[PDB]
Amino acid sequence: GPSFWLGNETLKVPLALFALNRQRLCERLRKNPAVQAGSIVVLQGGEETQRYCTDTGVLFRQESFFHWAFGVTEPGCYGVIDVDTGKSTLFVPRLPASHATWMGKIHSKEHFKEKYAVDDVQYVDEIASVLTSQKPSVLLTLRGVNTDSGSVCREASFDGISKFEVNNTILHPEIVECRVFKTDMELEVLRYTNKISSEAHREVMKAVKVGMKEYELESLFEHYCYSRGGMRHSSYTCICGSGENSAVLHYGHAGAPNDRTIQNGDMCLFDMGGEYYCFASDITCSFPANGKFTADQKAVYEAVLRSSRAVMGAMKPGVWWPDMHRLADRIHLEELAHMGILSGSVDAMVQAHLGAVFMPHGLGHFLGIDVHDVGGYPEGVERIDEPGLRSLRTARHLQPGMVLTVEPGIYFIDHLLDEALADPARASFLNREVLQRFRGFGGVRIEEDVVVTDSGIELLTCVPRTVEEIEACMAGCDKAFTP
Amino acid sequence: GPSFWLGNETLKVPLALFALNRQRLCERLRKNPAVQAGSIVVLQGGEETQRYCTDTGVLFRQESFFHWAFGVTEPGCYGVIDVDTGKSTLFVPRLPASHATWMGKIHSKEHFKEKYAVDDVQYVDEIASVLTSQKPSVLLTLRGVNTDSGSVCREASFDGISKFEVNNTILHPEIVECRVFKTDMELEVLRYTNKISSEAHREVMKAVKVGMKEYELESLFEHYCYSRGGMRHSSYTCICGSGENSAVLHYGHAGAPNDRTIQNGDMCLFDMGGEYYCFASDITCSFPANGKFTADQKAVYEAVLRSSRAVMGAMKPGVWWPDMHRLADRIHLEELAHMGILSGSVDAMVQAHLGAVFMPHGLGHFLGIDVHDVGGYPEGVERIDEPGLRSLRTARHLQPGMVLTVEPGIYFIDHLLDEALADPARASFLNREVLQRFRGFGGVRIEEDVVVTDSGIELLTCVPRTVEEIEACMAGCDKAF
Ligand SMILES: [Mn+2]
Ligand SMILES: [Mn+2]
Ligand SMILES: [Mn+2]
Ligand SMILES: [Mn+2]
Ligand SMILES: [O-]
Ligand SMILES: [O-]
Numbered sequence: 001g002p003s004f005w006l007g008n009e010t011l012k013v014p015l016a017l018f019a020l021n022r023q024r025l026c027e028r029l030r031k032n033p034a035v036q037a038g039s040i041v042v043l044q045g046g047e048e049t050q051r052y053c054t055d056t057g058v059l060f061r062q063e064s065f066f067h068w069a070f071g072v073t074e075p076g077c078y079g080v081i082d083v084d085t086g087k088s089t090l091f092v093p094r095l096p097a098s099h100a101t102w103m104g105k106i107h108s109k110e111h112f113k114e115k116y117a118v119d120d121v122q123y124v125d126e127i128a129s130v131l132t133s134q135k136p137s138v139l140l141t142l143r144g145v146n147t148d149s150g151s152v153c154r155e156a157s158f159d160g161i162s163k164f165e166v167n168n169t170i171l172h173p174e175i176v177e178c179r180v181f182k183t184d185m186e187l188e189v190l191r192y193t194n195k196i197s198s199e200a201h202r203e204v205m206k207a208v209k210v211g212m213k214e215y216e217l218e219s220l221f222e223h224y225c226y227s228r229g230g231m232r233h234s235s236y237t238c239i240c241g242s243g244e245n246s247a248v249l250h251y252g253h254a255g256a257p258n259d260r261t262i263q264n265g266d267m268c269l270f271d272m273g274g275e276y277y278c279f280a281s282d283i284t285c286s287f288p289a290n291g292k293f294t295a296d297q298k299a300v301y302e303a304v305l306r307s308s309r310a311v312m313g314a315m316k317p318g319v320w321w322p323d324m325h326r327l328a329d330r331i332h333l334e335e336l337a338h339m340g341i342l343s344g345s346v347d348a349m350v351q352a353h354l355g356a357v358f359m360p361h362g363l364g365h366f367l368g369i370d371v372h373d374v375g376g377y378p379e380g381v382e383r384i385d386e387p388g389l390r391s392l393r394t395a396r397h398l399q400p401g402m403v404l405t406v407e408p409g410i411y412f413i414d415h416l417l418d419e420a421l422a423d424p425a426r427a428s429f430l431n432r433e434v435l436q437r438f439r440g441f442g443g444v445r446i447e448e449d450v451v452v453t454d455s456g457i458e459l460l461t462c463v464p465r466t467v468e469e470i471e472a473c474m475a476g477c478d479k480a481f482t483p
Numbered sequence: 484g485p486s487f488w489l490g491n492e493t494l495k496v497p498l499a500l501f502a503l504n505r506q507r508l509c510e511r512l513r514k515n516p517a518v519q520a521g522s523i524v525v526l527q528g529g530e531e532t533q534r535y536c537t538d539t540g541v542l543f544r545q546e547s548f549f550h551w552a553f554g555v556t557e558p559g560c561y562g563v564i565d566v567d568t569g570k571s572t573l574f575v576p577r578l579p580a581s582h583a584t585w586m587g588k589i590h591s592k593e594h595f596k597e598k599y600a601v602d603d604v605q606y607v608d609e610i611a612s613v614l615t616s617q618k619p620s621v622l623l624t625l626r627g628v629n630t631d632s633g634s635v636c637r638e639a640s641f642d643g644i645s646k647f648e649v650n651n652t653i654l655h656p657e658i659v660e661c662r663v664f665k666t667d668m669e670l671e672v673l674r675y676t677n678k679i680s681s682e683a684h685r686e687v688m689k690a691v692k693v694g695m696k697e698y699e700l701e702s703l704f705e706h707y708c709y710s711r712g713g714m715r716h717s718s719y720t721c722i723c724g725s726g727e728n729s730a731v732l733h734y735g736h737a738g739a740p741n742d743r744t745i746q747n748g749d750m751c752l753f754d755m756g757g758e759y760y761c762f763a764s765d766i767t768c769s770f771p772a773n774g775k776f777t778a779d780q781k782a783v784y785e786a787v788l789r790s791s792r793a794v795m796g797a798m799k800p801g802v803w804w805p806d807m808h809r810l811a812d813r814i815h816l817e818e819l820a821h822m823g824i825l826s827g828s829v830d831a832m833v834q835a836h837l838g839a840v841f842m843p844h845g846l847g848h849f850l851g852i853d854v855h856d857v858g859g860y861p862e863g864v865e866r867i868d869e870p871g872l873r874s875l876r877t878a879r880h881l882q883p884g885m886v887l888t889v890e891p892g893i894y895f896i897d898h899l900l901d902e903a904l905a906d907p908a909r910a911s912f913l914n915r916e917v918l919q920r921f922r923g924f925g926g927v928r929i930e931e932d933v934v935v936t937d938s939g940i941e942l943l944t945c946v947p948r949t950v951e952e953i954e955a956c957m958a959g960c961d962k963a964f
Contacts, residue, residue, distance in 0.1 A: 060737035100898035
């Protein structure tokens with residue numbers, strides 16, 4: 001069958017991937033006792049947009065549920081799936097013949113049918129007539145709450161939909177649950193996004209020089225990903241934090257736009273991940289700007305390496321994700337004490353939630369078509385109201401097919417350190433004579449993407465991770481070199 | 484005073500640029516007989532957005548009118564200007580101290596006052612209180628129709644605005660008219676965007692190899708512009724059309740995403756322009772993929788080079804832009820006749836609008852903070868309902884300080900050719916046996932950015948243009964042009 005492909009060394013993605021997703025969704029809905037015979041799933045794709053009131057077009061990137069089901073790259077479409085038969089119909093815009101003046105060949109409906117390997121293609125303005133003739137019982141539309149943004153998913157609507165019975169509650173938890181569990185075909189794409197983003201991270205580590213602006217490395221990363229990987233988009237805005245900016249967790253946005261000059265002795269924390277055909281990657285590499293870890297940098301870095309590897313070694317089906325977050329906290333506290341930054345009982349430190357001073361964010365999150373992927377908090381799974389844990393994007397138990405980031409870090413964040421020093425319950429654990437040395441250190445984060453297997457994990461990411469590996473990479477060693 | 488800068492070799496842009504724009508706006512409003520004493524201009528900045536229902540952030544780019552007036556890069560702001568005094572107040576979000584963890588330093592109001600060189604800074608949650616204390620007659624807000632998109636400008640709103648008298652008709656035509664005329668400080672930025680984008684086009688011409696994907700050159704272009712120019716955004720989505728795609732005017736978008744392999748013998752038409760601090764550039768270069776023009780390619784290319792230069796040379800204050808569009812049409816028809824694609828009287832061809840078969844788009848447009856900049860069709864300036872001319876984005880007469888693209892092209896577009904061949908009034912001019920050779924040729928566009936001066940134009944773009952320059956550039960020969 002047909003494949004999406006951007007040529008050269010880029011990945012061929014079979015359109016069968018999306019057919020399988022549609023099949024799996026139907027299979028799930030068929031098992032759902034509340035789904036009526038003759039129901040049809042109705043999804044509305046994204047539409048073209050412009051900047052504010054201008055005619056400056058914004059590059060169109062498909063809505064994630066619609067992409068998951070159909071893989072369609074064009075704006076202005078709808079898509080329906082008959083639950084009982086699995087039959088798929090794509091609705092595409094009707095462009096007047098005169099648009100050929102501007103657009104070139106206007107593609108036929110047969111073109112799209114062949115391209116996307118759907119059962120039928122119709123024009124969008126005919127959706128009411130086509131659905132009327134199929135005599136559906138119920139239209140199942142998409143409405144629900146994203147638990148990371150708090151936004152409500154956009155439910156499909158078309159002129160005449162009021163003539164139909166519409167249910168907008170059943171679909172969302174079901175299609176979310178399908179997205180949580182990745183197919184073999186989806187895993188091939190996520191291996192690829194990790195391959196290209198890993199290569200790009202290595203190129204960035206090889207190219208970094210003291211004196212460069214952070215954004216020069218953002219640019220280089222995105223150029224590698226697009227020119228060598230066919231990744232027109234990033235999965236999220238690149239975070240290129242140097243020096244103290246490596247302690248700024250959302251760094252790189254318009255208000256702090258990767259515009260610092262990298263200095264000798266800085267740590268760099270670069271969190272970047274290309275997107276291929278709407279599939280994410282999310283990788284963070286931490287390393288010394290000048291290519292040589294100081295003793296203090298080695299100690300902080302290796303503490304995060306220890307927690308990274310301990311969590312990866314413990315992950316398997318049945319593990320409760322919050323227990324992994326707490327494992328990373330404990331290890332960080334142990335290692336910060338072995339460094340002289342902290343003193344006292346680590347058991348007592350954990351009871352005081354001291355780990356959250358150094359890692360205020362969650363250990364990791366589902367990843368898929370969105371970088372913060374759907375389904376972390378389905379009904380009945382509760383957020384934990386404790387420092388650090390409250391920032392976790394899922395409190396689920398791990399199961400085969402889930403894809404997660406594993407991203408412990410340690411940061412030296414003044415207002416959190418100062419709060420701790422002001423708090424009699426935490427202040428005694430902090431040794432200021434050593435801690436003072438780490439004010440302005442920034443932070444270290446080591447972020448891997450992994451798949452939960454039947455018995456453990458598969459690591460998707462492939463970047464240098466030991467101090468020796470990183471120093472070798474920055475010294476321009478071939479990848480096929482083993483410190 | 485302070486300046487915007489991304490370090491290295493990037494341009495320092497004085498915040499005084501925006502202060503001058505505010506002054507100029509007030510001066511126009513003060514002359515407007517409908518403007519009441521004690522009016523306050525109220526603009527609302529852009530807000531942070533995410534992809535659909537996700538928490539995936541979209542990189543924030545400021546709304547163009549707000550940028551023009553204030554130069555502010557942060558989301559969630561408002562800005563007001565007292566018309567009678569010119570006093571400026573920026574309203575910034577009040578962030579809880581707890582935010583220092585994620586988005587970085589919680590800058591004070593004083594930090595922003597110094598950064599933007601405004602007269603006062605307040606928090607957004609205080610805007611109604613602050614404006615109430617100023618006892619305005621009326622709030623002047625932004626509402627109007629963009630004549631390229633057809634969209635209505637988003638008028639400012641805030642909690643409590645209903646307690647004020649608001650006028651949403653006066654401002655838009657006045658701030659649009661200010662934007663049409665670029666200040667010397669604005670021109671320095673547009674010289675820079677054209678410098679960097681010109682350099683990036685040159686690197687692309689040096690790098691193109693048969694067998695590459697179109698998007699490889701888009702990537703290189705944007706990488707040059709960001710890493711060397713500090714241009715995080717492009718002014719519009721890059722058009723990297725090769726072969727028959729160079730005849731596709733709307734190419735490079737999501738539905739046709741620069742995904743063709745460049746083949747030996749193809750023409751390339753690359754329309755790309757970096758954006759710096761929300762100021763545009765818009766440049767198109769056309770050239771053979773393999774670095775050597777064939778005779779047919781040379782003939783089509785030099786025809787557009789001739790119209791490009793004829794239009795630039797004729798532009799001066801008082802020239803009617805539609806006349807420049809028809810000048811290019813006439814030159815194209817002359818050259819296509821010399822080539823043998825056409826036969827007969829060029830006067831009769833013009834009368835039959837045959838030029839629009841080969842150039843269906845407008846000759847060029849205003850450029851500024853938006854690539855298709857505002858103010859092409861103010862009240863009293865009408866669109867001309869003829870082929871080609873109806874696509875013009877302005878029918879104004881030129882005046883010093885206007886910035887325009889000059890972008891004639893010749894394309895071989897099957898829909899338009901077939902229509903012409905069915906029409907006895909146009910078919911007689913077309914030599915089918917010669918035209919057949921050019922089916923699938925693609926197209927050529929040469930796009931320069933220029934400023935109207937007191938006596939002529941200033942050319943901002945600096946890329947290789949003659950056949951000799953282009954071939955030398957692509958062969959990897961040393962030096963400029
Ligand atoms: Mn990340
Ligand atoms: Mn992450
Ligand atoms: Mn252009
Ligand atoms: Mn243009
Ligand atoms: O992350
Ligand atoms: O253009």
